[PDB]
Amino acid sequence: LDAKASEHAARMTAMKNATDNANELIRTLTLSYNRARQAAITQEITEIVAGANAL
Amino acid sequence: QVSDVGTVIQVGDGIARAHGLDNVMSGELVEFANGVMGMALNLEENNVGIVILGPYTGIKEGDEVRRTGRIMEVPVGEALIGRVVNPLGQPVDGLGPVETTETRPIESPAPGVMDRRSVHEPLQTGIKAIDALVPIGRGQRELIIGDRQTGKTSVAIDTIINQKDQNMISIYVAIGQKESTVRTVVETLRKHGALDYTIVVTASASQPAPLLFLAPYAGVAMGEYFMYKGKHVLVVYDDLSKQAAAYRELSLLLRRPPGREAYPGDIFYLHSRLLERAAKLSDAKGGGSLTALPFVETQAGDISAYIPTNVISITDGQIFLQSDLFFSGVRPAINAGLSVSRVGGAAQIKAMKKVAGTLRLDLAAYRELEAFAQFGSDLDKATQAKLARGARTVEVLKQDLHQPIPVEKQVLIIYALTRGFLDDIPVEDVRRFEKEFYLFLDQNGQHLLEHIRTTKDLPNEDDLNKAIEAFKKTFVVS
Amino acid sequence: QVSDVGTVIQVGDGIARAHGLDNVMSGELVEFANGVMGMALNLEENNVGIVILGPYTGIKEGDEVRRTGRIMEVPVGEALIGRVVNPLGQPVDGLGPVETTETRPIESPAPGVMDRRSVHEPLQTGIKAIDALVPIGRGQRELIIGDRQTGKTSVAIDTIINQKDQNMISIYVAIGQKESTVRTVVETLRKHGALDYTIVVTASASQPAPLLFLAPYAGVAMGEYFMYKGKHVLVVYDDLSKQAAAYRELSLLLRRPPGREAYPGDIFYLHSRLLERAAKLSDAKGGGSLTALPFVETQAGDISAYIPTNVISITDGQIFLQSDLFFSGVRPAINAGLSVSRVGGAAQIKAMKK
Amino acid sequence: MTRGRVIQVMGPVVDVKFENGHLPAIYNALKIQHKARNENEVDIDLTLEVALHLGDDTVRTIAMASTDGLIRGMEVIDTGAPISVPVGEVTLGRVFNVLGEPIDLEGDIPADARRDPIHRPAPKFEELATEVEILETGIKVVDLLAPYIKGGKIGLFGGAGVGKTVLIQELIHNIAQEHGGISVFAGVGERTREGNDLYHEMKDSGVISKTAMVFGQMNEPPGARMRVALTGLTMAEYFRDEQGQDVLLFIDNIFRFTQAGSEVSALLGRMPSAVGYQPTLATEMGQLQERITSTAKGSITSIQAIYVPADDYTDPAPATTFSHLDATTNLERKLAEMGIYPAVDPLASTSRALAPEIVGEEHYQVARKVQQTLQRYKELQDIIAILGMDELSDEDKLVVHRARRIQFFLSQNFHVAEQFTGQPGSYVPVKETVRGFKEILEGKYDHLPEDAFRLVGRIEEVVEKAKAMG
Amino acid sequence: GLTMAEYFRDEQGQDVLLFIDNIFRFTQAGSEVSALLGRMPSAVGYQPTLATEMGQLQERITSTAKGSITSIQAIYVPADDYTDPAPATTFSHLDATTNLERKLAEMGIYPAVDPLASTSRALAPEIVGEEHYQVARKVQQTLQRYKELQDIIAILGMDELSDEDKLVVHRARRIQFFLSQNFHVAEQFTGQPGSYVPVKETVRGFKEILEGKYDHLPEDAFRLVGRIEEVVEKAKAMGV
Amino acid sequence: ALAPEIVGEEHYQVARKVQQTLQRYKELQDIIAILGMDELSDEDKLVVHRARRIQFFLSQNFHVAEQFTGQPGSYVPVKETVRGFKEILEGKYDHLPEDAFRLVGRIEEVVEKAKAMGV
Ligand SMILES: Nc1ncnc2c1ncn2[C@@H]1O[C@H](COP(=O)(O)OP(=O)(O)OP(=O)(O)O)[C@@H](O)[C@H]1O
Ligand SMILES: Nc1ncnc2c1ncn2[C@@H]1O[C@H](COP(=O)(O)OP(=O)(O)OP(=O)(O)O)[C@@H](O)[C@H]1O
Ligand SMILES: Nc1ncnc2c1ncn2[C@@H]1O[C@H](COP(=O)(O)OP(=O)(O)OP(=O)(O)O)[C@@H](O)[C@H]1O
Ligand SMILES: [Mg+2]
Ligand SMILES: [Mg+2]
């Protein structure tokens, strides 16, 4: 009984820690994704305008 | 020496630049020497930029172009019903001329603030999910947005078909599609009987860009004729993205300054002009209304692109369709979590409003608290009740092709679901339960059906329970 | 005769073009018909490119432009202490004219390699965290970097206030800030008695971009006036990101090809010019010093962005203020892991550094 | 000389040539009034705004309406001043467009009324207020957790059916009742159906007589959608400067203002900024916002509804807009469904003014304690769901007991909500709500039922409701 | 080539097969010269007349009352990005669509047809049959369910999956492997000869696999096999 | 210059082994990021154990850095570096704490500071 209780508590704690780590990783990846999206828009518009005014 | 004539200087890519035309107006029609027509968009200091509305291979530098003195306009009338037509008002199916005795300009002011009335009449599309969770009212403009091969055209066709027994005139605008696909759509509509009240406007991929640019406005004018006559019109735009691309092509050929993603600066103004002409008119100038269902095709589910964001901002609501939902077995594929209707409940009958609230909460409490199903297999907490209710709701919301459901039958089945009469029928049998319940209704519940159709309200709950139990004792579960 | 008189050809978006002005020199001040100042930027073969340092609505093509004969300059002196002025030296507090008697150029070379000395005198900011972990010396250039609403302005104000009993001149330059916030800052300084040794230079968000571009250079010139006279000066640039944005705007309106994040190619040189003037002079040059505390506003704590990286590459260290640590009740949110002083410790007193 | 001629038309952009030496100034308004000379012409009534001086006596302008039917060489006249809109008591209860002409059918404003220029510089440094002053709104949650500041800018975030319109109407009513200040609503990029519904709702609620409405519709050109905010601000500045009142300004969506500016820049041909925006994004935002300030004789406070593109708060438009905000209000559909009105999120909402230096030590302590208790209750939600509340320790149960009562007491009965509930409304002073929350925190009303806190004003009303319940 | 085919379609009323080696090269060549022609660039550097030219070319390839042309075209996808403007515009011109993904190619499955993204107007109950429609839909549903499980499998392992999801993976892997085939022209790459599988036989085999008759067979026995008979015979070579 | 005929056979082998262990640790870092070191097999746990100590021993205290941290710098011969890294790869110092490998020069200083701390 003591072993089963300890196993359940350990599983609960490990899953809580894993969930927190996954949430933090999601936040960092979202920040990086937004920066990449802004950079892509900047590059495409710069190329568009350079080609347009190169005539 | 006269100022009503000019000579062409440059020809190419579907546009022409002509010297002269001193007194030409902005947006006026012009006629070339060989007989083709054009529209004057750019009025520079010494030349006029003209977009050509036909084959430009016959136009050469130095030939003559003449004024017409009138703005672009299209024929309007009841003679267009049952016809498939180009944006210029010329038939494309043969079958003879159109015989229309009236015209209407393409560009017209939208109804003012004081000319309108609050949206209060439902638009029954025959789709359970749309009618229950994202209501559409007469005069509302609702965006239908999703990826390719998801069912937007099927939704539009079902909505058009469902308008048979209602005093509604439908207009279908096909932009940039294959003429074969348009022919197939027209054939399906003819088979289901929609050509008695439907008009089709086509601007295929082989047509010049200005025709694709002008097609939705021609559809809007044709709808506005009936709207100002006092009737109700439904207008569908099968792709606004292709029209925007055609306008972008014209603007880039005319050497106008490009904006984000090469689109011109007035691309938002174009779509706002187009979609602002759908309205619900006040009783002071007739109760007619025009409702619009624009389409937008997203790329890899990206709703943050320029045109999707513009149309989402402009419209009164969005219906999102998902490919994973489509492939998971949810054929309507409507994402109720993201789909939103900003006029909702003003566009529903009382019977539907009295069950839609419970249905929405059940669906939400399933969609969140999902992913517990695998661990809910190990029965815990009695959350399995919510899980089973959500699964049965999802099974109920499924629907087949070209089979719209009457609003009274939708209300009855949603009442049966929300009151717990399906809790002992397994999810595998919900479709059969609904299919046989409709027949049981039209056999032995004509009083309930007539009561709903007349009073727009639910019948007595005791009688409803009696009928449902009577059917349920005869339904065999397997 | 168009030697000292010009005529405007084009006006728009704060940039004008003039015909004539044959004798004008590059970087000269010009005066418009309505009294608005301008700077001669480009000397083309036929026309002159002029940057308007003020409201350009009253300037119309065909107006008269005349030479001033002076390189772009600002007034300096002791009469400027205790006053709030614009980047052109015009008072805005409403206390009357400023009686300065000499001027200094806005563009001036930095002290040479042999004109400097190692930093060895402590600048006591009065904040325990900074004075312990990130010591600041007189002549050092320390960056203050963090997100919005994290306490950079409070740190700067406390540092300025702490100099009450120390022989220091303080200059507060606010680029792109709100006028109400600048008014409250001035009121707090007046209440704590810092106006006896403080000069405030302001260029709000509603001002044209050239004024925001010019403000830090006016501040550093005002500081250099005292610095080269043997005194010690502290200069605070409340936001260099606003100046960078204004300069990017001006470059794009000049149709110069943008680069990373649409910034021009000389955005690094823009800040290097400004920050290379702060130095510790040698005994042969007088022993004066100028201390700079530039500010940079990051987005979501991204310290690896283009402008933050450029500013880090110039200064002598940085103090990082962390947003989530600030919201956790540690109001002086110094992130000790990412904060360092490269020339500190040599200035820290012996008692503190053990 | 004041006569020009149209020389070039390309979409919403029109170039006009003038006589040498008589060019119009920047931002000046030009008028085109043409009658069809023959069958091949159409009547024109169009207004233009000067944007650039291209040289050779030519001026580039942006149209405020459609340019269809324009003919090169037609006459243009210069008004000699920027756009001017009527100001004063005549603007109350009326709906205007960007030109200042009334949209409603109540008649036109006489030409003898005073009119003010749309473009003007911000108030000078020495005309501003020297201290920060709190604006009492009468709403408990706002006055406690996210205090408003006279002359400050407040961002508004919420869902479709949270109740933003009801909150706006209640703010208008409370300010007009207790401070004597009018409000101005600026419909930047307003849908016509939404504008009609809003007008009818204002007329039904009765706050129409204390407000002036300016609508810039979606189907209007980018110039009009740019200048609607400025004309609303001009209408508010009259009441700030002349009557000395404390005025409220509402903006439909400032993101549409920034997008209209970007579209205008693209049409003018200026090179795009980092993420495709105009180079002058910060300058335009500062010019708009810096006029909303508190002066020695009055103040204007502004409520902005802000759209975040792609949910990215690092995007340049939200990043520039957030630099001017002083507070933030978030509305929650969870609270709306739970029955909490106003549906203001007690944890997500933030305010710069919640500092002991300006709001008071007791107020700050009470607000912090309330937020801490609600955060603890939010933390305990999952364990309360999984296991019965009895399993919680006595301290946790006491925390939940306090927190539910506090959450219910955050609600309030609005004056404009009588049309929904039949019961009247309440105006709660900030000191009253602070004292009430302090008493609730001290356990004075632990024995009262939680439904007595549902919708009341003063703390005494909870006691009265409990006594009536028995 | 199009006009050569059009002559036969119109004048003789023959049935014509039109094969195009790569239709994306037409778009690429059109874009290579737009800047020299003097046109301002479009979004991704393409010519402004991209959609117009593509439609003017594609709309001539159609079946009429005088004759029918069925055309099979290979369409290149630059950098595997299906959101590229050329494939995005090309998608609207087709009736049946086959998508190839290199994720299946890296795993050794050929012809590596994506079982979900591939669409056809002919997949309808009245066109192909009710049993065929239902078995195809069940296969698609099983594969869609499998695709979601990979993300959690790659982290938490198969041991944490429920008994239902374990069976779903077990059958989905076998279905995906049986989707492979050996082509006659693939002898140079596989050694073994090709095969020809009729629609009735493949429907029957996929129905059996969906029912789970061959759960005990190893998953490797389904690689490039043709029918299920060859699967069960190839299993004998491994001693199963 | 990292070639067997230039630096020596044992030098090349030690460098290659160190690079291999570091690559394996870099591959595992994704799994340790989410679910920690508990689910790693006995081989991967030993790889992490060796890789952390190797990475810390790659640090050094510089003479110039004496102005920033008061510690004096060190100069390490390449033969001593090779011997130390070979010993760490062989598992001689698996029992020492990983914080004893930071900012030291020769492998003897690791033992000295581990003895200075608790051991
Ligand atoms: N409710 C449904 N039940 C069964 N099949 C459906 C249903 N809705 C759509 N489909 C099928 O799914 C496919 C979607 O085709 P549809 O033309 O409706 O999509 P679309 O989004 O307009 O695509 P596109 O224009 O890109 O071809 C068709 O094969 C259609 O028959
Ligand atoms: N040490 C402190 N103790 C308490 N409150 C503080 C402290 N430092 C700053 N604050 C408060 O925190 C807030 C931070 O504002 P501050 O102007 O100092 O920051 P900032 O980074 O310059 O912000 P912004 O971008 O708005 O200019 C202010 O309300 C200020 O009063
Ligand atoms: N204080 C309140 N008391 C009672 N009911 C309220 C209150 N606030 C909102 N409601 C209810 O919620 C509904 C939605 O409110 P409201 O019309 O203000 O929405 P909204 O969020 O402003 O809308 P939108 O985003 O569409 O402009 C109201 O019609 C009313 O039924
Ligand atoms: Mg379709
Ligand atoms: Mg600050």
Residue numbers in the entry:
A (entry chain G): 230 to 284
B (entry chain A): 24 to 501
C (entry chain B): 24 to 377
D (entry chain E): 1 to 470
E (entry chain D): 232 to 471
F (entry chain F): 353 to 471
Quoted passage from the original study:
F1 domain of ATP synthase is a rotary ATPase complex in which rotation of central γ-subunit proceeds in 120° steps against a surrounding α3β3 fueled by ATP hydrolysis. Upon dissociation from the Fo domain, the F1 domain can catalyze the reverse reaction, i.e. hydrolysis of ATP driven by rotation of the central γ subunit inside the cylinder comprising α3β3. The catalytic sites are located at interface between the α and β subunit in each catalytic dimer. Here we describe catalytic intermediates of the F1 domain in FoF1 synthase from Bacillus PS3 sp. during ATP mediated rotation captured using cryo-EM.
